[PDB]
Amino acid sequence: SQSLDRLMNPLIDQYLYYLSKTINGSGQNQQTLKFSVAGPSNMAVQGRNYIPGPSYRQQRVSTTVTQNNNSEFAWPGASSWALNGRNSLMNPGPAMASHKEGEDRFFPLSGSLIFGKQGTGRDNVDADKVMITNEEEIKTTNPVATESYGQVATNHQSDGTLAVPFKAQAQTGWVQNQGILPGMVWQDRDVYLQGPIWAKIPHTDGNFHP
Amino acid sequence: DGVGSSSGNWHCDSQWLGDRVITTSTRTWALPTYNNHLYKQISNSTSGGSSNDNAYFGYSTPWGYFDFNRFHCHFSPRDWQRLINNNWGFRPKRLNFKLFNIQVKEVTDNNGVKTIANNLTSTVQVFTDSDYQLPYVLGSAHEGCLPPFPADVFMIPQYGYLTLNDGSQAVGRSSFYCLEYFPSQMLRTGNNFQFSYEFENVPFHSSYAHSQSLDRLMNPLIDQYLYYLSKTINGSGQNQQTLKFSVAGPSNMAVQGRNYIPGPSYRQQRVSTTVTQNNNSEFAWPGASSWALNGRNSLMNPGPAMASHKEGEDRFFPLSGSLIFGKQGTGRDNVDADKVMITNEEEIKTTNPVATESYGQVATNHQSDGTLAVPFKAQAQTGWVQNQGILPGMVWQDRDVYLQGPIWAKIPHTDGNFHPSPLMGGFGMKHPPPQILIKNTPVPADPPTAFNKDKLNSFITQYSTGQVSVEIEWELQKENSKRWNPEIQYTSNYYKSNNVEFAVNTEGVYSEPRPIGTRYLTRNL
Amino acid sequence: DGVGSSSGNWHCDSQWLGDRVITTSTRTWALPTYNNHLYKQISNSTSGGSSNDNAYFGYSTPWGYFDFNRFHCHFSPRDWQRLINNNWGFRPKRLNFKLFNIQVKEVTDNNGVKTIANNLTSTVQVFTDSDYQLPYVLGSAHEGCLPPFPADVFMIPQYGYLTLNDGSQAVGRSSFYCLEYFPSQMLRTGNNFQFSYEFENVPFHSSYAHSQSLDRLMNPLIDQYLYYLSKTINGSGQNQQTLKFSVAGPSNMAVQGRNYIPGPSYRQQRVSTTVTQNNNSEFAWPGASSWALNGRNSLMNPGPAMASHKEGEDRFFPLSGSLIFGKQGTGRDNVDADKVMITNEEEIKTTNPVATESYGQVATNHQSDGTLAVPFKAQAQTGWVQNQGILPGMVWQDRDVYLQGPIWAKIPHTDGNFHPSPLMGGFGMKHPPPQILIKNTPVPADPPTAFNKDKLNSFITQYSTGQVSVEIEWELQKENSKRWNPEIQYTSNYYKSNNVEFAVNTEGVYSEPRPIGTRYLTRNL
C-alpha cells in the first residue's frame, strides 16, 4: 500500500541537499553551483535508502491490435538469452510490473503467464481465447517490464581542459537491463490458482534468489 | 509523584568501559499543538506545487515525534574523536529513553497580550510504535532532531506520512492511519515515560581506511606463474599475426591475475568547486543520474558508495554522490558553495570505483581477420561500462558515517534486498528504534449550554515542555594494528583563531566547523 | 492520585482472538452545564409546535449521558471489513467502561473576554442506571454518540425523557424523576470511574445472505409425488367442467408443495430516486404506512424487515422502510437525495417479502355454478393481502446492521412481545448496557451576607473535559462454507480519486462514503 519512491514524511524536509542549479540563466560563462534542500515539494530528488529491483526489458504489445506495429515481431523483437549457441525466450523472466498506471491494454511480449480459457485450441488462437495475467500489484517495488529502469551518465560534462577544446554537455544512456545492486528490493511473481506450486532448484554451485 | 517533585534528573554524560561506551543525553523540548488537533489530508495540490516527479498524497497529523537519529545527538565532538581515533568499529547495543518533568502551559490572548499560565490537570499522550505498524519517517534525514548542544531547547517536529498517490489523487490502496487508534500513555506533570529497546544484531561500522589497494595486493618481488597475452603481431606489415605470452610480474602489475574486483558502480556527473572549469549551462537536474519508479524520476542521491574523486582531484565532487550539510545559519535555498560543506568518500578508493569514472571497459565485438561469412576484418572494440551491478568476487566498503549524519535506517519490508546497509550511511535494521509519538491532549474551551452534535472545534491554546533523555550503549572494536608507522588521527589545530572550533561564539550560537567522518585508522586489505 | 498524575491511558486498539474480537476506543469529551442546573418541564407548547401526533410532555434534565450505541464507535472501517468478510455472525459478550483524566474548567467573562481557568476542587457526578429504573433513551437512534474518528472531540448530549401526555398536558400517571435522587460518584480530577457489564445471551446476528431462495428449495430433477389441480374445464363451451390433476415437478415449480413460507409483511409505498417516475403530488405523510396509539399516528419507520425492492428495481425504495443516513455536512431539513444515503435490504429477498409488494392473494368468495339458495354463478375471486401477520411455518430474516447504525435496543417491559429484535436492527435486550449519566456539580457564585431562603440561582460557569474508553468483547461465528465458488466480499476500489474513502480530506473532516452492511457471505437455506 506504499510505493518505494514515496516512502518519506511529506511534511518535513530532509536535511540533505541536492544540486539544483548549474547556471545563472541565459548567457556565456555563467556557471554556478546552487544547492537546495530536498523536501516535500520535490520528492524526485529526495535521498533514498532502497532502490527498485532488477530489470530485463521486454517488448510492449497492446491488446488493441491497431496500436501494434504492422509487422511480425513475436520472435524477432523478443528478449532472449543464449546458451551454447541457441536462443531461448526469456519467458517470463524476472518479476516486473506488467504495465504502468493507466495502461492496462499493454502487456510484455513474454513477461506474463498466459493461460487458455476452456476448450481453447493448441495453435494460433485469438486473444479472447486466452487470459493474460498481469503483475501490476508489484509496481510499488519492481520496475515496469516494458520500461528501461532509469538512465546513467555516459560521459564527462565539461567546459574545456588542456587535453581537448571540445566542450561536452552531460549525456545519459538508457539502462535496458539492470542486474542486482546493493540496496535493491523487489517482490516475486504471483501465484495463481491455475499456476504451479513448486519448482526444483537446479543443482549448481551458485544460484541467486532461487 | 505530584506537582512539587521532579520525575527525573539531568544526565548527559559519556562513560567509556572496556569495549563499551554508554552515551546519555538530556535535552529540553517544547511541543506545540499541530494542525489544531486535526488530521488534514495533504497533496502537492494542497501546497500548489505541480510536477509529476514531485506529486504526493498523504496525511498531516496532530502528533509530534522524537528523532535522535543523528550521531551528534549522542556524541560530543570530543567523544567522537575519542571513538574514531582508536577504534576499528562500533555498533549500537541497547537504547533507553526517558521523558520526565512534563509541564503543560496554557497561553491566553487578551487584547493582543500573551499570558502563559501552567495547566496542572492537562495531559500529554505518548506511545512508541513498537509493532512497526505506522509509516516510519525516521531514516529520511529530516531536520528535526535533538540538538547537538545540550543547552539548546528544541521544538518537536510534526509527524506526517505519505501514502500511494495517483499524482495528487489517492487510490484504493492508499492507507489512512489514525494515531489515536493506538494505546497511548497519558501524563500530567507528575508522570514520566520510560522506554527500553535492544538493537538487533548489526555489523560493526568500518571505522578505518584500508592501507592497501585492491589492485596492489600481491608480492612486488616474485612473478605470478600465470601468463598473459602480450603481443598479437610482430610489428608493422601485412599478414604478421603472432601469439606471444609473458609472465605477469612486478614490472607489469596491470595484467596480473587477481582474485577480487572492485565493487559496483553507477556513474555520476563530475562538478568542480572551481566554477570556471564547469560547463556554462544548467545541468543540475538534466545531467543527473536518476532512477525511475512508476513513471517518475528520483535523483540517485547519494547512491552506491563510491570514491568521490581520484587521487589529486579534490576540487571535483559527484553531482549527487555525496552528503552535503549546511554549516550554521545557512539558508534553505540557492546558498553559496562556501555556505555548505561537501563530504567526500576518498578513503574507499582502495576498493570502490570512483563515482565519476566508468568502471573499466568490456569487449563489444569479435575481432577478426576474415571468415566465410563476411570479408569485413574487424579490430577489437571496447565499450565503456558506466553502471556495473554486483558480480561474484566483488568487494566494497559502505559509505562513512559522520557526526552530523544519521545512525540507523529501517530496511523496507520486501521479499528481497541486497546488502541493506542504508545508502546515506549507518546501520540498516529490520526493527529500528521505534518511533515515539507525542501529543498534547486537546482541552475544549467551553461547550454551548444547549446540545450540539458537531465535534467541538473550540480549544484552549496550550503547549507542553519537558526533558528527554536518551541512553545508548555502543559496542566498540579496539584497533589492534602491528603497524610501526604513526597513524593519521583526527585533531584540532593549535593556531590562534577568533573562536574555538565546536564551541559557541560571542552571540552564543553553537556551530560545527566541518563534517567529521569515522575513517582515520588503517587496516590491511 | 493527584493533580499531576494521569488516571488512565489512551487505548483504542482492536485485538482479534480465536473466536473473539475485543474492541477498545478512547475519545475526548466535553461536558457543559445543561439547563443552568435546572429540571425544566417541556411540552410541545413549550417549543410551540402544535400537532396531536407530535404532542409531548416531559422533562429536561441538567445531566448528560454517554452513548456508544453505534457500531462505528467501536469498529474502524477496516475492522468492520475484517468482521463482515469472514464471519457468519457475531454478538457482544462483555462491556468495560472507563472515565479518566477529568478536568473541570471555569470560564469567566470580563467585559466580553473569555478566560478559561481550571478549577481543581470542583467535581463531576457520574452514575450508571444499573437497576434500569430511569427512562431509557438509548435505542432511539439519537445523534449524540462517540464520534467514529478517534481524533474527534465530542460534546455530551443532554439527558431528558418523555412521560404520559394529554396533548401538551400531563396526567396523574405521569412520572417525574430527579436524577439527583440516585447515588452518584463524585470525581475531582484525580479520580476515575470504571464500569463492567455482561451482555445477556443474545442470538448471533446473521452476517450472511442466503444463497438459496425459499421458493427454490427442492430438487430440480425429480417430481414431487404430490398432485395439484391443473384443469377445471375442458376448453371452450358450456357445461364442460372437469377436475384434472397433475404431478408437481421441475417444469412447474410455482405449484410445488412447500414446507415453509415467507415471513410477515406490512406494505409500504414505493418511491423511486428517478423523480420523474414519481407521482406529481405530495404523499410523504399522506400515503405512508402508519400505526395508531391512543388516537395518534406514527410512521411505521422502518417496520418489519422486508426486501427493499424486487430484482432489477434498485431505483425504488419503500417510503419509510429503510434507514436513511446523512453523508457528511448534510443539513437538518429538506436536503437533496444525493445528500443522504438510503440503505436497502435486498439480501433478504430470499426469505422476506418485498416491502412494496402485497404478499400474494387469498380467495375472497365461493366459486360456484348454481345451488338452491341462489341462481347466481360466481367465479373465483381473489383479494390482495397487503399486511400479513405471523403464520405457522413462516421464516424470515431480521434487518441488517450497519457500521453507521445502532447495536442494541432495550426490549420494553411488557407482558408479551414477539421476536423482540429491534426493528432498526441490532440486539434486543431486556437489560441492555446501562445508561451512564454525568453532571458538573453546581458551584454557587457567592451567597449574600444576610440569609436568604431562596435556592441560590447564581453559579460559577464551568465545564468538564475528560477521556472515555469503551471496551467490548465480541463473540464471532466463523464462516464454514463448502462452496467452491469465490464469494462476494466488501472491498475498496483501486481507482484514482481525490480522497481516500474513510479518511480525512484536506480540511481534516472525516467522512464515511457509503453505509456498509454485514451480509456479504452466503449460506444455504
XYZ file of C-alpha atoms in Angstrom, chain B:
525
model
C 4.638 11.953 42.306
C 2.981 15.360 42.418
C 3.459 18.915 41.253
C 6.308 19.727 43.630
C 8.583 16.751 42.971
C 10.633 16.222 39.825
C 10.195 12.957 37.930
C 13.767 12.705 36.676
C 17.217 14.224 36.716
C 19.549 15.682 34.134
C 22.058 13.142 32.861
C 24.104 13.878 29.735
C 27.465 12.181 30.293
C 29.570 9.586 28.469
C 31.155 6.552 30.146
C 33.899 4.556 28.445
C 34.042 0.931 29.586
C 36.289 -1.824 28.295
C 34.631 -2.386 24.916
C 31.511 -0.298 25.604
C 30.870 3.476 25.566
C 27.486 4.482 27.097
C 26.197 7.831 25.828
C 23.465 9.672 27.700
C 21.996 12.982 26.627
C 19.249 15.119 28.152
C 17.508 17.915 26.258
C 14.644 20.294 26.923
C 11.817 20.081 24.399
C 8.751 22.134 23.600
C 5.681 20.587 21.987
C 3.078 22.813 20.309
C -0.321 21.700 19.159
C -0.154 20.739 15.498
C -2.988 21.143 12.968
C -5.394 22.423 15.643
C -5.771 18.753 16.662
C -6.789 17.776 13.123
C -5.891 15.093 10.584
C -5.691 17.159 7.416
C -5.032 15.411 4.116
C -2.176 16.908 2.106
C -1.172 16.787 -1.546
C 1.105 18.583 -3.959
C -2.060 20.432 -4.965
C -2.617 21.284 -1.288
C 0.596 23.317 -1.411
C 0.059 24.048 -5.116
C 3.331 22.608 -6.431
C 2.923 20.893 -9.804
C 5.367 18.284 -11.091
C 4.673 14.581 -11.576
C 8.042 13.692 -10.049
C 7.140 15.828 -7.024
C 3.471 14.819 -6.775
C 2.426 13.316 -3.458
C -0.598 12.418 -1.355
C -0.587 11.922 2.370
C -1.716 12.947 5.792
C -0.716 15.595 8.286
C -1.135 14.515 11.871
C -1.568 16.461 15.138
C 1.242 14.399 16.692
C 4.905 15.117 17.084
C 7.690 12.594 17.244
C 11.132 12.310 18.775
C 14.120 11.974 16.467
C 17.581 11.292 17.839
C 18.808 9.599 14.668
C 21.988 11.604 14.357
C 25.360 10.943 15.891
C 25.793 14.441 17.294
C 22.666 13.809 19.382
C 24.737 11.313 21.373
C 28.434 12.140 20.921
C 30.226 15.327 21.770
C 32.936 16.239 19.254
C 35.478 15.166 21.858
C 33.678 11.835 22.356
C 33.539 11.368 18.589
C 37.287 11.970 18.385
C 37.882 9.553 21.248
C 35.859 6.980 19.293
C 37.215 7.442 15.761
C 40.834 7.812 16.823
C 41.282 4.406 18.418
C 38.539 2.014 17.313
C 38.170 -0.079 14.179
C 34.412 -0.303 14.521
C 31.394 0.314 16.669
C 27.712 -0.548 16.750
C 24.695 0.238 18.938
C 23.663 -2.325 21.548
C 20.703 -1.101 23.608
C 18.686 2.076 23.895
C 16.997 3.689 26.869
C 14.510 6.537 26.528
C 13.082 8.715 29.293
C 10.533 11.518 29.313
C 10.192 13.470 32.526
C 9.334 16.810 34.132
C 6.446 17.484 31.771
C 4.678 20.815 32.148
C 1.629 21.843 30.165
C 1.254 25.594 29.813
C -1.867 27.469 28.754
C -1.323 30.597 26.683
C -4.054 33.233 26.698
C -4.519 36.183 24.333
C -6.236 39.181 25.932
C -6.256 42.214 23.616
C -3.104 41.004 21.896
C -1.309 40.265 25.181
C 0.236 36.831 25.707
C -0.051 35.463 29.232
C 1.336 32.000 29.924
C -0.154 30.083 32.836
C 0.509 26.442 33.565
C -2.342 23.935 33.426
C -1.737 21.348 36.140
C -4.519 18.987 35.042
C -3.890 18.751 31.305
C -2.144 15.694 29.906
C 0.254 14.748 27.150
C -0.122 11.497 25.206
C 2.900 9.352 24.380
C 3.309 5.984 22.732
C 6.028 4.040 20.965
C 5.127 2.341 17.685
C 6.731 -0.875 18.902
C 4.985 -3.208 16.432
C 6.186 -1.077 13.485
C 2.653 -0.652 12.176
C 2.968 3.045 11.368
C 4.778 4.608 8.415
C 8.368 5.074 9.513
C 9.666 8.594 8.894
C 12.912 8.330 10.797
C 15.591 7.377 8.329
C 14.844 10.130 5.805
C 17.449 12.596 7.173
C 14.954 15.158 8.434
C 15.826 18.410 10.204
C 14.002 17.868 13.464
C 16.397 16.053 15.778
C 17.692 16.551 19.289
C 20.132 19.485 19.099
C 23.886 18.768 19.219
C 24.464 21.220 22.006
C 22.961 20.066 25.323
C 21.995 23.594 26.366
C 19.625 24.071 23.420
C 15.836 23.829 23.569
C 14.166 22.289 20.553
C 10.712 22.117 19.049
C 9.264 18.672 18.396
C 8.619 18.159 14.659
C 5.135 17.417 13.392
C 4.510 13.829 12.363
C 3.064 13.053 8.949
C 3.290 10.416 6.269
C 2.731 9.804 2.577
C 0.734 7.009 1.014
C 0.139 5.899 -2.564
C -0.736 8.741 -4.916
C -2.062 8.960 -8.451
C -0.491 12.346 -8.966
C -2.374 14.472 -6.476
C -5.117 11.847 -6.050
C -5.287 8.823 -3.788
C -6.010 5.276 -4.934
C -7.791 2.315 -3.386
C -4.636 1.001 -1.723
C -3.950 4.335 -0.026
C -3.907 3.798 3.718
C -5.020 6.232 6.384
C -3.810 5.930 9.962
C -5.492 7.420 12.987
C -2.747 7.694 15.574
C -5.379 7.939 18.321
C -6.205 4.315 17.474
C -3.126 3.174 19.255
C -2.965 2.827 23.057
C -1.084 5.813 24.468
C 0.175 6.729 27.903
C -1.289 9.863 29.461
C 0.933 12.107 31.571
C 0.076 15.155 33.698
C 3.204 16.759 35.144
C 3.826 14.206 37.863
C 4.233 11.334 35.455
C 7.190 10.158 33.443
C 7.698 7.803 30.473
C 10.430 5.097 30.206
C 11.215 3.019 27.075
C 13.889 0.284 26.584
C 14.972 -1.127 23.204
C 17.529 -3.725 22.133
C 19.179 -3.173 18.772
C 19.160 -6.168 16.507
C 22.495 -7.625 15.527
C 24.065 -5.162 13.092
C 27.618 -5.447 11.730
C 30.273 -3.150 13.102
C 30.643 0.002 11.059
C 34.075 0.014 9.398
C 35.798 2.838 11.279
C 39.028 2.593 9.289
C 40.516 3.173 5.876
C 42.421 0.489 4.001
C 46.190 0.938 3.886
C 46.370 -1.303 0.830
C 44.758 -1.122 -2.592
C 42.769 -3.889 -4.247
C 44.948 -3.771 -7.384
C 48.171 -3.677 -5.334
C 47.548 -6.811 -3.329
C 50.472 -9.017 -4.415
C 54.130 -9.531 -3.566
C 56.169 -6.993 -5.590
C 59.237 -9.278 -5.599
C 58.030 -12.510 -7.222
C 56.410 -13.349 -10.562
C 52.996 -14.972 -10.741
C 53.349 -18.303 -12.672
C 50.376 -17.142 -14.770
C 50.809 -15.888 -18.323
C 49.048 -13.157 -20.251
C 48.823 -12.456 -23.956
C 51.359 -9.689 -24.535
C 51.881 -9.497 -28.315
C 49.388 -10.171 -31.099
C 51.530 -9.043 -34.062
C 55.213 -8.976 -34.988
C 55.483 -5.301 -35.852
C 54.489 -3.355 -38.928
C 53.439 -5.183 -42.067
C 50.717 -7.353 -43.524
C 49.843 -10.920 -42.524
C 52.071 -10.751 -39.441
C 49.960 -12.159 -36.620
C 51.502 -13.955 -33.681
C 50.540 -15.051 -30.197
C 53.234 -14.265 -27.629
C 52.811 -14.736 -23.898
C 54.782 -13.441 -20.957
C 54.764 -13.882 -17.200
C 52.801 -11.402 -15.123
C 55.210 -9.937 -12.616
C 56.155 -6.824 -10.672
C 57.117 -4.891 -13.811
C 53.571 -5.168 -15.220
C 51.119 -5.124 -12.327
C 48.177 -4.106 -14.514
C 47.949 -7.515 -16.279
C 48.475 -9.540 -13.038
C 45.742 -12.145 -12.275
C 43.574 -11.161 -9.310
C 41.082 -12.872 -7.032
C 38.790 -9.938 -6.214
C 37.422 -6.944 -8.084
C 36.114 -3.503 -7.104
C 32.522 -3.109 -6.051
C 29.614 -1.928 -8.159
C 29.200 1.452 -9.793
C 26.542 3.884 -11.010
C 28.248 6.773 -12.736
C 27.593 10.346 -11.627
C 28.391 13.682 -13.206
C 31.614 15.401 -12.066
C 31.169 19.003 -10.741
C 34.178 21.129 -9.656
C 34.161 23.738 -6.857
C 36.171 25.946 -9.207
C 33.165 27.054 -11.226
C 35.222 28.261 -14.188
C 36.009 24.627 -15.006
C 32.303 23.784 -15.085
C 30.272 23.943 -18.261
C 28.370 27.183 -18.847
C 24.967 25.518 -18.782
C 22.312 24.347 -16.343
C 22.827 20.644 -15.700
C 21.955 20.099 -12.020
C 18.791 18.182 -12.815
C 19.374 17.460 -16.549
C 22.583 15.501 -16.389
C 21.926 13.883 -13.039
C 21.887 10.134 -12.543
C 18.398 9.043 -11.592
C 16.143 6.057 -11.191
C 12.508 5.797 -12.213
C 9.618 4.258 -10.306
C 6.082 4.105 -11.712
C 6.881 6.755 -14.294
C 8.647 9.359 -12.159
C 12.314 10.100 -11.634
C 14.265 10.365 -8.402
C 17.777 11.685 -8.031
C 20.133 8.826 -7.212
C 21.307 10.794 -4.173
C 23.625 9.533 -2.910
C 23.502 6.108 -4.495
C 26.061 3.340 -4.119
C 29.107 4.161 -2.027
C 31.765 5.282 -4.490
C 35.011 7.180 -4.176
C 34.165 10.854 -4.587
C 37.232 11.687 -6.680
C 40.566 10.272 -7.965
C 43.944 10.983 -6.259
C 44.987 14.638 -6.846
C 41.432 15.776 -7.791
C 39.818 17.213 -4.597
C 38.053 20.071 -6.423
C 35.706 17.575 -8.075
C 32.630 16.100 -6.452
C 29.862 13.917 -7.874
C 26.671 15.811 -8.619
C 24.559 13.835 -6.133
C 27.010 11.286 -4.795
C 27.933 12.942 -1.516
C 26.188 14.185 1.588
C 26.112 17.980 1.757
C 25.480 19.598 5.124
C 24.738 23.210 5.918
C 27.255 24.991 8.093
C 25.374 27.215 10.568
C 22.754 29.818 9.824
C 22.797 28.582 6.239
C 19.580 29.462 4.370
C 17.142 26.968 2.743
C 17.611 27.897 -0.965
C 20.350 28.784 -3.504
C 23.069 29.232 -0.845
C 26.720 29.701 -1.993
C 29.188 26.753 -2.075
C 31.059 28.185 0.934
C 27.778 28.124 2.888
C 27.702 24.296 2.792
C 30.248 21.553 3.413
C 30.565 18.680 0.943
C 31.725 15.367 2.366
C 33.935 13.032 0.359
C 34.497 9.297 0.226
C 38.165 9.268 -0.735
C 39.152 6.673 1.886
C 37.253 3.962 -0.010
C 39.058 4.491 -3.326
C 41.143 1.447 -2.369
C 38.164 -0.859 -3.030
C 35.371 1.201 -4.537
C 35.290 2.719 -8.028
C 35.487 6.475 -8.415
C 31.979 7.925 -8.564
C 32.561 9.957 -11.732
C 34.626 7.405 -13.677
C 33.179 4.473 -15.683
C 34.358 1.153 -14.048
C 36.654 -0.073 -16.882
C 35.610 -1.384 -20.303
C 34.257 -4.532 -21.935
C 34.714 -6.025 -25.368
C 31.892 -5.109 -27.718
C 32.604 -7.211 -30.827
C 34.630 -10.100 -32.230
C 37.975 -9.049 -33.628
C 38.764 -10.969 -36.785
C 40.781 -11.224 -39.978
C 38.247 -12.840 -42.306
C 35.806 -15.748 -42.434
C 33.399 -17.309 -44.899
C 30.500 -15.263 -43.529
C 31.969 -11.821 -44.218
C 35.152 -10.338 -45.714
C 34.993 -7.472 -43.191
C 38.003 -7.525 -40.873
C 37.019 -6.058 -37.510
C 39.534 -4.847 -34.978
C 38.854 -5.214 -31.272
C 36.347 -2.660 -29.997
C 35.583 -1.792 -26.386
C 32.674 0.000 -24.784
C 32.670 1.917 -21.511
C 30.899 0.357 -18.535
C 29.016 3.244 -16.929
C 26.987 1.192 -14.447
C 28.015 -2.209 -13.107
C 25.878 -4.388 -10.917
C 27.258 -6.826 -8.400
C 29.465 -9.622 -9.715
C 30.922 -12.585 -7.834
C 34.355 -11.837 -6.449
C 33.380 -8.217 -5.825
C 34.319 -6.383 -2.629
C 33.405 -2.887 -1.468
C 33.130 -0.598 1.534
C 29.987 1.202 2.627
C 29.515 4.937 2.975
C 31.012 6.612 6.018
C 29.050 7.905 8.955
C 29.506 11.442 10.204
C 28.935 13.177 13.495
C 26.321 15.272 11.642
C 24.827 12.235 9.908
C 22.240 9.538 10.562
C 22.754 6.441 12.681
C 20.149 3.920 11.524
C 17.591 3.307 8.807
C 14.629 0.969 8.608
C 15.086 -1.732 5.988
C 11.904 -1.717 3.870
C 9.816 -4.847 4.347
C 10.221 -6.597 0.996
C 10.734 -10.077 -0.384
C 14.294 -9.294 -1.415
C 17.011 -6.828 -0.610
C 20.741 -6.885 -1.162
C 23.240 -5.653 1.420
C 20.631 -3.493 3.156
C 23.087 -1.017 4.551
C 21.478 2.434 4.189
C 22.848 4.389 1.263
C 23.237 7.572 3.322
C 25.256 5.602 5.858
C 24.514 3.952 9.149
C 23.059 0.695 10.417
C 20.192 -0.842 8.479
C 17.712 -2.644 10.700
C 14.504 -4.552 10.107
C 13.331 -3.327 13.534
C 14.991 0.015 14.242
C 14.319 2.042 17.384
C 10.568 2.622 17.460
C 9.043 5.987 16.750
C 7.911 7.864 19.853
C 4.771 9.869 19.100
C 3.695 12.646 21.449
C 0.644 14.908 21.518
C -0.975 17.462 23.784
C -4.389 16.193 24.801
C -6.976 18.639 23.399
C -8.866 20.606 26.036
C -12.150 22.053 24.731
C -12.694 25.722 25.509
C -16.324 25.571 26.680
C -19.325 23.840 25.101
C -22.620 25.599 24.407
C -25.284 25.129 27.055
C -27.680 23.569 24.541
C -26.527 20.333 22.968
C -24.825 20.309 19.577
C -23.644 17.174 17.782
C -20.743 18.866 15.973
C -17.234 17.981 17.067
C -16.230 20.956 19.244
C -13.611 22.855 17.255
C -13.020 25.422 20.035
C -9.996 24.574 22.160
C -7.764 26.038 24.816
C -4.387 27.028 23.394
C -1.572 25.247 25.164
C 1.821 23.662 24.695
C 3.933 21.244 26.667
C 7.547 21.319 27.799
C 9.752 18.678 29.334
C 13.064 16.905 29.459
C 14.001 13.932 27.305
C 16.948 11.640 27.918
C 18.396 9.060 25.532
C 20.899 6.437 26.648
C 22.678 4.272 24.069
C 25.218 1.570 24.808
C 27.720 1.129 21.989
C 29.929 -1.896 21.443
C 33.450 -0.965 20.289
C 36.076 -2.792 18.150
C 39.528 -1.809 19.516
C 42.213 -1.108 16.847
C 44.880 -3.885 17.042
C 47.424 -2.865 14.380
C 51.014 -4.070 14.149
C 51.866 -1.013 12.057
C 55.176 0.607 13.024
C 54.262 3.918 11.439
C 52.295 6.552 13.365
C 48.741 6.764 12.076
C 46.519 9.553 10.839
C 44.327 10.900 13.630
C 41.576 13.456 13.798
C 42.938 16.503 15.598
C 42.189 20.115 16.298
C 44.738 22.686 15.190
C 46.955 24.758 17.515
C 46.576 28.081 15.613
C 45.120 31.326 17.125
C 41.535 31.918 15.946
C 38.576 34.128 16.762
C 36.533 31.223 18.136
C 37.214 27.721 19.365
C 36.012 25.065 16.937
C 32.940 23.212 18.234
C 32.104 25.895 20.786
C 29.788 28.880 20.973
C 30.655 32.324 19.701
C 30.111 35.718 21.396
C 26.441 35.517 20.217
C 26.026 32.141 21.998
C 25.246 30.092 18.884
C 26.917 26.689 18.681
C 28.375 25.640 15.344
C 30.072 22.558 13.934
C 33.467 23.735 11.654
C 33.456 20.650 9.345
C 31.842 17.175 8.875
C 33.923 14.599 10.795
C 33.939 11.067 9.351
C 34.915 7.846 11.191
C 37.751 6.566 8.908
C 41.150 7.638 10.307
C 42.788 4.367 11.354
C 44.041 1.880 8.775
C 43.862 -1.842 8.124
C 45.337 -4.204 5.583
C 43.045 -5.469 2.863
